Design an enzyme around this catalytic site. Structure first.
Site, PDB file in Angstrom:
ATOM      1  CD  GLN A   1     -16.187  21.928 -27.197  1.00  0.00           C
ATOM      2  OE1 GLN A   1     -15.599  22.895 -26.709  1.00  0.00           O
ATOM      3  NE2 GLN A   1     -17.013  22.041 -28.230  1.00  0.00           N
TER       4      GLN A   1
ATOM      5  CG  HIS B   1     -15.667  16.631 -29.272  1.00  0.00           C
ATOM      6  ND1 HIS B   1     -16.383  17.465 -30.105  1.00  0.00           N
ATOM      7  CD2 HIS B   1     -16.375  16.552 -28.118  1.00  0.00           C
ATOM      8  CE1 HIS B   1     -17.470  17.882 -29.478  1.00  0.00           C
ATOM      9  NE2 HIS B   1     -17.489  17.342 -28.272  1.00  0.00           N
TER      10      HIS B   1
ATOM     11  CG  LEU C   1     -22.828   9.740 -19.659  1.00  0.00           C
ATOM     12  CD1 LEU C   1     -21.732  10.476 -18.878  1.00  0.00           C
ATOM     13  CD2 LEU C   1     -23.053   8.347 -19.063  1.00  0.00           C
ATOM     14  CE1 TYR C   2     -17.126  12.001 -20.559  1.00  0.00           C
ATOM     15  CE2 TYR C   2     -17.179  14.404 -20.688  1.00  0.00           C
ATOM     16  CZ  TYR C   2     -16.571  13.240 -20.259  1.00  0.00           C
ATOM     17  OH  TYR C   2     -15.404  13.322 -19.531  1.00  0.00           O
TER      18      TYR C   2
ATOM     19  CG  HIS D   1     -23.850  21.350 -24.609  1.00  0.00           C
ATOM     20  ND1 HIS D   1     -24.313  20.089 -24.912  1.00  0.00           N
ATOM     21  CD2 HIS D   1     -22.839  21.600 -25.476  1.00  0.00           C
ATOM     22  CE1 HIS D   1     -23.631  19.607 -25.936  1.00  0.00           C
ATOM     23  NE2 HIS D   1     -22.730  20.504 -26.295  1.00  0.00           N
TER      24      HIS D   1
ATOM     25  N   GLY E   1     -21.259   7.286 -15.716  1.00  0.00           N
ATOM     26  CA  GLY E   1     -20.054   7.844 -16.327  1.00  0.00           C
ATOM     27  C   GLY E   1     -18.758   7.143 -15.964  1.00  0.00           C
TER      28      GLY E   1
HETATM   29  C1  COH Z   1     -17.890  17.668 -22.853  1.00  0.00           C
HETATM   30  C2  COH Z   1     -18.448  18.873 -22.692  1.00  0.00           C
HETATM   31  C3  COH Z   1     -18.857  19.732 -23.912  1.00  0.00           C
HETATM   32  C4  COH Z   1     -18.615  21.043 -24.077  1.00  0.00           C
HETATM   33  C5  COH Z   1     -17.868  21.962 -23.081  1.00  0.00           C
HETATM   34  C6  COH Z   1     -19.173  21.453 -25.359  1.00  0.00           C
HETATM   35  C7  COH Z   1     -19.146  22.719 -25.932  1.00  0.00           C
HETATM   36  C8  COH Z   1     -19.841  23.140 -27.059  1.00  0.00           C
HETATM   37  C9  COH Z   1     -19.807  24.458 -27.684  1.00  0.00           C
HETATM   38  C10 COH Z   1     -18.972  25.669 -27.208  1.00  0.00           C
HETATM   39  C11 COH Z   1     -17.640  25.640 -27.311  1.00  0.00           C
HETATM   40  C12 COH Z   1     -20.628  24.447 -28.744  1.00  0.00           C
HETATM   41  C13 COH Z   1     -20.907  25.628 -29.705  1.00  0.00           C
HETATM   42  C14 COH Z   1     -21.216  23.123 -28.840  1.00  0.00           C
HETATM   43  C15 COH Z   1     -22.114  22.686 -29.792  1.00  0.00           C
HETATM   44  C16 COH Z   1     -22.309  21.375 -30.188  1.00  0.00           C
HETATM   45  N1  COH Z   1     -22.013  20.258 -29.426  1.00  0.00           N
HETATM   46 CO1  COH Z   1     -20.904  20.277 -27.634  1.00  0.00          CO
HETATM   47  N2  COH Z   1     -19.748  20.331 -25.931  1.00  0.00           N
HETATM   48  C17 COH Z   1     -19.580  19.257 -25.079  1.00  0.00           C
HETATM   49  C18 COH Z   1     -20.031  17.972 -25.315  1.00  0.00           C
HETATM   50  C19 COH Z   1     -20.537  17.464 -26.497  1.00  0.00           C
HETATM   51  C20 COH Z   1     -20.517  16.071 -26.893  1.00  0.00           C
HETATM   52  C21 COH Z   1     -19.938  14.884 -26.095  1.00  0.00           C
HETATM   53  C22 COH Z   1     -21.193  16.032 -28.274  1.00  0.00           C
HETATM   54  C23 COH Z   1     -21.432  14.797 -29.165  1.00  0.00           C
HETATM   55  C24 COH Z   1     -20.247  14.674 -30.118  1.00  0.00           C
HETATM   56  C25 COH Z   1     -20.558  13.717 -31.239  1.00  0.00           C
HETATM   57  O1  COH Z   1     -21.323  12.743 -31.005  1.00  0.00           O
HETATM   58  O2  COH Z   1     -20.039  13.927 -32.369  1.00  0.00           O
HETATM   59  C26 COH Z   1     -21.552  17.401 -28.576  1.00  0.00           C
HETATM   60  C27 COH Z   1     -22.190  17.830 -29.726  1.00  0.00           C
HETATM   61  C28 COH Z   1     -22.346  19.134 -30.157  1.00  0.00           C
HETATM   62  C29 COH Z   1     -22.877  19.572 -31.439  1.00  0.00           C
HETATM   63  C30 COH Z   1     -23.375  18.629 -32.567  1.00  0.00           C
HETATM   64  C31 COH Z   1     -24.904  18.596 -32.559  1.00  0.00           C
HETATM   65  C32 COH Z   1     -25.474  17.250 -32.177  1.00  0.00           C
HETATM   66  O3  COH Z   1     -26.599  16.941 -32.658  1.00  0.00           O
HETATM   67  O4  COH Z   1     -24.836  16.489 -31.395  1.00  0.00           O
HETATM   68  C33 COH Z   1     -22.854  20.920 -31.458  1.00  0.00           C
HETATM   69  C34 COH Z   1     -23.318  21.849 -32.610  1.00  0.00           C
HETATM   70  N3  COH Z   1     -21.150  18.202 -27.508  1.00  0.00           N
HETATM   71  N4  COH Z   1     -20.712  22.359 -27.800  1.00  0.00           N
HETATM   72  C1  LIG Z   2     -14.112   6.521 -23.865  1.00  0.00           C
HETATM   73  C2  LIG Z   2     -12.786   6.165 -23.263  1.00  0.00           C
HETATM   74  C3  LIG Z   2     -12.185   7.346 -22.519  1.00  0.00           C
HETATM   75  C4  LIG Z   2     -12.549   7.336 -21.046  1.00  0.00           C
HETATM   76  C5  LIG Z   2     -13.350   8.572 -20.655  1.00  0.00           C
HETATM   77  C6  LIG Z   2     -12.543   9.364 -19.658  1.00  0.00           C
HETATM   78  C7  LIG Z   2     -13.030  10.269 -18.808  1.00  0.00           C
HETATM   79  C8  LIG Z   2     -14.477  10.657 -18.662  1.00  0.00           C
HETATM   80  C9  LIG Z   2     -14.633  11.297 -17.297  1.00  0.00           C
HETATM   81  C10 LIG Z   2     -15.741  11.274 -16.543  1.00  0.00           C
HETATM   82  C11 LIG Z   2     -17.046  10.590 -16.907  1.00  0.00           C
HETATM   83  C12 LIG Z   2     -18.235  11.135 -16.132  1.00  0.00           C
HETATM   84  C13 LIG Z   2     -18.458  11.030 -14.810  1.00  0.00           C
HETATM   85  C14 LIG Z   2     -17.553  10.350 -13.802  1.00  0.00           C
HETATM   86  C15 LIG Z   2     -16.567  11.362 -13.252  1.00  0.00           C
HETATM   87  C16 LIG Z   2     -16.132  11.421 -11.988  1.00  0.00           C
HETATM   88  C17 LIG Z   2     -16.566  10.476 -10.885  1.00  0.00           C
HETATM   89  C18 LIG Z   2     -15.367   9.714 -10.328  1.00  0.00           C
HETATM   90  C19 LIG Z   2     -15.003   8.534 -11.224  1.00  0.00           C
HETATM   91  C20 LIG Z   2     -14.335   7.416 -10.453  1.00  0.00           C
HETATM   92  O1  LIG Z   2     -14.245   7.518  -9.207  1.00  0.00           O
HETATM   93  O2  LIG Z   2     -13.890   6.431 -11.076  1.00  0.00           O
END
Ligand code: COH
Ligand SMILES: CCCCC/C=C\C/C=C\C/C=C\C/C=C\CCCC(=O)O
Ligand code: COH
Ligand SMILES: *[C@@H]1O[C@H](CO)[C@@H](O[C@@H]2O[C@H](CO)[C@@H](O[C@H]3O[C@H](CO)[C@@H](O)[C@H](O)[C@@H]3O)[C@H](O)[C@H]2NC(C)=O)[C@H](O)[C@H]1NC(C)=O
Ligand SMILES: *[C@@H]1O[C@H](CO)[C@@H](O[C@@H]2O[C@H](CO)[C@@H](O)[C@H](O)[C@H]2NC(C)=O)[C@H](O)[C@H]1NC(C)=O
Ligand SMILES: *[C@@H]1O[C@H](CO)[C@@H](O[C@@H]2O[C@H](CO)[C@@H](O)[C@H](O)[C@H]2NC(C)=O)[C@H](O)[C@H]1NC(C)=O
Ligand SMILES: *[C@@H]1O[C@H](CO)[C@@H](O[C@@H]2O[C@H](CO)[C@@H](O)[C@H](O)[C@H]2NC(C)=O)[C@H](O)[C@H]1NC(C)=O
Ligand SMILES: CCCCC/C=C\C/C=C\C/C=C\C/C=C\CCCC(=O)O
Ligand SMILES: CCCCCCCCO[C@@H]1O[C@H](CO)[C@@H](O)[C@H](O)[C@H]1O
Ligand SMILES: CCCCCCCCO[C@@H]1O[C@H](CO)[C@@H](O)[C@H](O)[C@H]1O
Ligand SMILES: *[C@@H]1O[C@H](CO)[C@@H](O)[C@H](O)[C@H]1NC(C)=O
Ligand SMILES: *[C@@H]1O[C@H](CO)[C@@H](O)[C@H](O)[C@H]1NC(C)=O
EC number: 1.14.99.1
Lengths: 552, 551
Positions: free
Chosen positions: B172, B176, B353-354, B357, B495
């Site tokens: 996260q 971000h 794809l990231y 949640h 990814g």
């Molecule tokens: C990578 C994994 C990950 C995690 C663990 C996580 C953990 C959490 C978390 C608990 C700590 C909460 C309360 C939220 C809640 C939200 N997430 Co994420 N988020 C994650 C990936 C993302 C990503 C990537 C975005 C889009 C970010 C952007 O485009 O600004 C996102 C967007 C959001 C948004 C904006 C709404 C929208 O329309 O996109 C909220 C609210 N969320 N998320």
């Molecule tokens: C936007 C620039 C920053 C780069 C983003 C960095 C990390 C994102 C990590 C993972 C993305 C999602 C899936 C791929 C993860 C693991 C598979 C092995 C990748 C490999 O064998 O190669």
């Protein structure tokens, strides 16, 4: 003071302080090692022995016309030689870029901030004992003295290569898309954030300006019709900001992409030509694609004109400048199996070397008239009176001035020439010899060696004392030219790598872009790959007058 | 309608309209020819004969642990293999970038305007008869129905790869910096104009913000000391704008580079850790260089931290994700004899794809407490009460959810999951199968093939009718995972190319930057090259608690 002040690291080694009075050179991938990166590796030693000088290569390229006639007419050989030309000059530019006026070490601020011109050499540190580092006097000579003694025109010196006013105004129009100094911030800052050939001098730097310049029908740019002739629209029609004196009549206040192009009718001539070219390409694409809307017609035409520009610059403009018998070729494909970065950042020094003010004549001769500088400046009525056809005919026939060789800067622009020296100093430029070394050239060992003569060399010796503190800009304008050539060695050897990067580094040259579909199909692609300075004028100027970058 | 609506051109061929009712495919450099770029050239046939699938390559990398242990111990073989990994993932990304949400054709606007996320596939045209082009029904299924039937968690499904909360919050925090949607403009726009790993989430996106965050002494960032512990400074102290609910007291309004990081205590944990890392590196450089001023100390530290970040992401983070027995390596030199563009533009689909949640637990377990989402959100007093050491210890042992396999999105974030689907449609995303083909994967021939089971597949068949109009985002969350893995094939294959491009595309990886002097000499350079998730925590967290991305 900074321990790197003397510029101790050679052969592109990088200097870093390691205490208050100590330095270390980083010799990584230089092909040299030892304290100052001066001990060559074995392979480097062999490579140095086998490398011909720039002057030797230039000699070969400007002789043996019989051989070049065969090479030019065999596509495989021509491509092979052009591939060599492209790749040999390629390795000299840092890309991604590194230093700028505020950063003599690599930093994220220098990399990321597009408002800066980049720097081929870091600035001299602020605390160095002399302006150039450690060599020379406490002060550099009075810039006005340098100007008057060795730069100012006594008598007009014509270009022996035969460059004309079509060439001189093309150079000014073309380069002013990417040399756009942000005078509000300083000489090390640019307003051209695209850092290359984006044609913002036609379309505007910002989306807001672009939209004010567009018709929003058929992909076209707005225009007016005066006496049956198509000209750019006005400031009042568009709400597009331009630089004009208060006394200029409303309909002569033409609005174009670049705010300063109302400055001279020579620039407005080209602004008008390119505006017409954009709309002509719009007509062609509309015929090809009756199903397309205004937005796609506009964008596709822009990409086509970018291509046309790079094509003309390489095959006509650079070809002319070079004096080569070999025919240079615009072909992105030549790099597809090579290592090359499709990106560019405009270098401050590229801007500096391009201050070709000796090109300017004493008078601008149109038809039967001979206009002074005062009469020519900001005077679009001259353009409308004579018309574009007469402009092309007259400018094609009028000789431009020699740039190297000394004493050919017209007095009318003495202040601009003085500004080039003063701003170089403000930006803490390293010496001529440091720049020569940076571009694999042998340092000059005397002022006489630099100029190839005695009188100016004596004036410079008395002004500067040491050849090692001679400055870049004035040196380029006093340098001994190549035989019957417009430029000396230093101009070509610094200029060419910067030019290549700006031209071939454009995204349209990348494999994912260099395809017929990018340009609306084969018809659009053909427009690019057949563009010439002659076809440009022929398509857009009444009567299709003959034109050329040389008087002949 | 647009003649290209049906996506007729195959194998990376480009579709162009040629009249109202007709198209032409541009097959340049695709290795195919014919009307739809489907007739292979001879060499292409031989290439397609030998090329193993992503599934068998995954098998090889996740088996033969004995062989890989030998391989990992021969530097030359490890280098050779890592080079293959990097170069095979390279050719899949358009660089310089091409399409965006407003441009289904190449344009200077699309190339030059950094406010856009770029697009790996052009949007579906506005006048297409169906949302996905020509296939499927007039409307896609209600996104609420898709969400409720196949996405929402019933029982918590733990990740079988053993991903923990340290991993979830790192994901996260890290992403971000480059996923920063500009909601003022729309889902296809970003505020992350650096488009990669610039650490703007620590230093700020603009120079004004950076300067408010900096101490201007010893290259350091501003901080406060609470109970002998170093934390970020306040909004009051810095005048740095942050997003906080109105009830958050001034002392709890921590100021960091990324405006949204105060909203989640797991994000504030990493913000604090990295701020401490920056100031620690400043200390080291200052004793290496007593002659240096504040500005150079700051800039050099930033570069070192960028390098540390890429090192950790490849060798700990991606390593953990992959489940490979092969030890991945961060080594910029591996590309120095290769064709590679040192530039990146963040793709909208990479953002999409990231949206992991399902990773999120039902409660956040620190020490003896179990915090609900309501209690956890915007609540930095939890960080202060427990401390960083306890946060690390607790998050290291708490398991995350499985992302693929379906039905594992926690109810607490149901609106965000629904937004992911809705915004994909708003952005006119092409179908799952279009994206699969774009990344050299075989299209799915049925919903059952996608999920590897019967029940969810039957629900999706009832909702979508045709497998060829299945959407990308819900598909990633319901996809049949690799054996005992967190992800299915589509997640990994899409990814990984976006990832390595953002990591290796960074300017510090280029030959003119990748030198000891860029980082203040050999000591600064070694900091990058020995960085790990464990060292980050050990150097900066009281007691040096043990950590990793698993368990
Ligand atoms: C990578 C994994 C990950 C995690 C663990 C996580 C953990 C959490 C978390 C608990 C700590 C909460 C309360 C939220 C809640 C939200 N997430 Co994420 N988020 C994650 C990936 C993302 C990503 C990537 C975005 C889009 C970010 C952007 O485009 O600004 C996102 C967007 C959001 C948004 C904006 C709404 C929208 O329309 O996109 C909220 C609210 N969320 N998320
Ligand atoms: C936007 C620039 C920053 C780069 C983003 C960095 C990390 C994102 C990590 C993972 C993305 C999602 C899936 C791929 C993860 C693991 C598979 C092995 C990748 C490999 O064998 O190669
Ligand atoms: C290519 C050759 C060339 C020619 C023929 C030429 C012809 C002329 C000319 C007569 C037609 C006049 C009156 C001037 C006058 C000026 N030149 Co040029 N210039 C040329 C090359 C340049 C370059 C390059 C710059 C720097 C542009 C920048 O940085 O903005 C420049 C800068 C200037 C500037 C200040 C920069 C600005 O405010 O934009 C003025 C004023 N001048 N020049
Ligand atoms: C790229 O670099 C430019 C040069 O550093 C930079 O311009 C500078 O921006 C800063 C901060 O925005 C300005 O400093 C201001 O900050 C405070 C206001 O509280 C005052 O101390 C100053 O008086 C001033 O107002 C500088 O004025 C400015 N320097 C200039 C114009 O030369 C750009 O912001 C950078 N661009 C990006 C995108 O980061
Ligand atoms: C690297 O360069 C340094 C400094 O430029 C050299 O030191 C100079 O050596 C020359 C001998 O030719 C003397 O003229 C100068 O007095 C020295 N300058 C200073 C300030 O030390 C140094 O010897 C070079 N190192 C090597 C290994 O060649
Ligand atoms: C290229 O693709 C097009 C469209 O997918 C094919 O044309 C369609 O083919 C189907 C089945 O043969 C027909 O039922 C449709 O009427 C066609 N749709 C059209 C023309 O819009 C075409 O056969 C393919 N061409 C080649 C050479 O394989
Ligand atoms: C990048 O594209 C966006 C979207 O077109 C541009 O933002 C628009 O700018 C226009 C003209 O100034 C405004 O009328 C709108 O408010 C903007 N639309 C939005 C916010 O979605 C933006 O200017 C472009 N960036 C650059 C550098 O040109
Ligand atoms: C490497 C790309 C093309 C190869 C060029 C080969 C030889 C060049 C010969 C003469 C060039 C003379 C001076 C160069 C100074 C500025 C470049 C102008 C073109 C541009 O403003 O861009
Ligand atoms: C002609 C444009 C202004 C010239 C300024 C006069 C400054 C004196 O400069 C002198 O010019 C002489 C004639 O060229 C040279 O012979 C001398 O070497 C030079 O010092
Ligand atoms: C334990 C709940 C697991 C969800 C199973 C699918 C049925 C979900 O049902 C929906 O759940 C949403 C979130 O609870 C509610 O907002 C809706 O009102 C409810 O209909
Ligand atoms: C502008 O050019 C016109 C001819 O087109 C000429 O009569 C006039 O003298 C010029 N104006 C100035 C101010 O020199
Ligand atoms: C915030 O967390 C604390 C525990 O440190 C708890 O007392 C409080 O109830 C929480 N606040 C909210 C609004 O849940």
């Amino acid at each position: 003071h900074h321990p790197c002040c003397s510029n101790p690291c050679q052969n592109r080694g990088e200097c870093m302080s390691t205490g208050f009075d100590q330095y270390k050179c980083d010799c990584t991938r230089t092909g040299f090692y030892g304290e100052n990166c001066t001990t060559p590796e074995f392979l480097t030693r062999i490579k140095l022995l086998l490398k011909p000088t720039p002057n030797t290569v230039h000699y070969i390229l400007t002789h043996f016309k019989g051989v070049w006639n065969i090479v030019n007419n065999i596509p495989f050989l021509r491509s092979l030689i052009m591939k060599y030309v492209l790749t040999s000059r390629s390795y000299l530019i840092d890309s991604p870029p590194t230093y700028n006026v505020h950063y003599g070490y690599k930093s994220w601020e220098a990399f990321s901030n597009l408002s800066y011109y980049t720097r081929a050499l870091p600035p001299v540190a602020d605390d160095c004992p002399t302006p150039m580092g450690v060599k020379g006097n406490k002060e550099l000579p009075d810039s006005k003295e340098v100007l008057e003694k060795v730069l100012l025109r006594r008598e007009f010196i014509p270009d022996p290569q035969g460059s004309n006013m079509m060439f001189a105004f093309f150079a000014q129009h073309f380069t002013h898309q990417f040399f756009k100094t942000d005078h509000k911030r300083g000489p090390g800052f640019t307003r051209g954030l695209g850092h290359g050939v984006d044609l913002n001098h036609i379309y505007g730097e910002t989306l807001d300006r672009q939209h004010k310049l567009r018709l929003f029908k058929d992909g076209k740019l707005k225009y007016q019709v005066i006496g049956g002739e198509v000209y750019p629209p006005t400031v009042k029609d568009t709400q597009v900001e331009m630089i004009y004196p208060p006394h200029i009549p409303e309909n002569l206040q033409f609005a174009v992409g670049q705010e300063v192009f109302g400055l001279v009718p020579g620039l407005m001539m080209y602004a008008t030509i390119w505006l017409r070219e954009h709309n002509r390409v719009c007509d062609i694409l509309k015929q090809e694609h009756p199903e397309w809307g205004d937005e796609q017609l506009f964008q596709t035409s822009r990409l086509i004109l970018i291509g046309e520009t790079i094509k003309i610059v390489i095959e006509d403009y650079v070809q002319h400048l070079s004096g080569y018998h070999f025919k240079l070729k615009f072909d992105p494909e030549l790099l597809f199996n090579q290592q090359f970065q499709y990106q560019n950042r405009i270098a401050s020094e590229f801007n500096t070397l391009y201050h070709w003010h000796p090109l300017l004549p004493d008078t601008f001769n149109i038809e039967d008239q001979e206009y002074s500088f005062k009469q020519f400046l900001y005077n679009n009525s001259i353009l409308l009176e004579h018309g574009l056809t007469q402009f092309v005919e007259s400018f094609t026939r009028q000789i431009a001035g020699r740039v190297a060789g000394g004493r050919n800067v017209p007095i009318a622009v003495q202040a601009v020439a003085k500004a080039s020296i003063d701003q170089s100093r403000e930006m803490k430029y390293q010496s001529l010899n440091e720049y020569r070394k940076r571009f694999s050239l042998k340092p000059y060992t005397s002022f006489e060696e630099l100029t190839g003569e005695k009188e100016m060399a004596a004036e410079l010796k008395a002004l500067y004392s040491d050849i090692d503190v001679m400055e870049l800009y004035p040196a380029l304008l006093v340098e001994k030219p190549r035989p019957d050539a417009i430029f000396g060695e230093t101009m070509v050897e610094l200029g060419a790598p910067f030019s290549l990067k700006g031209l071939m580094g454009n995204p349209i040259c990348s494999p994912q872009y260099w395809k017929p579909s990018t340009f609306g199909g084969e018809v659009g692609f053909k427009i690019i790959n057949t563009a010439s300075i002659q076809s440009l004028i022929c398509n857009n100027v009444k009567g299709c007058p003959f034109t050329s970058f040389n008087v002949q």
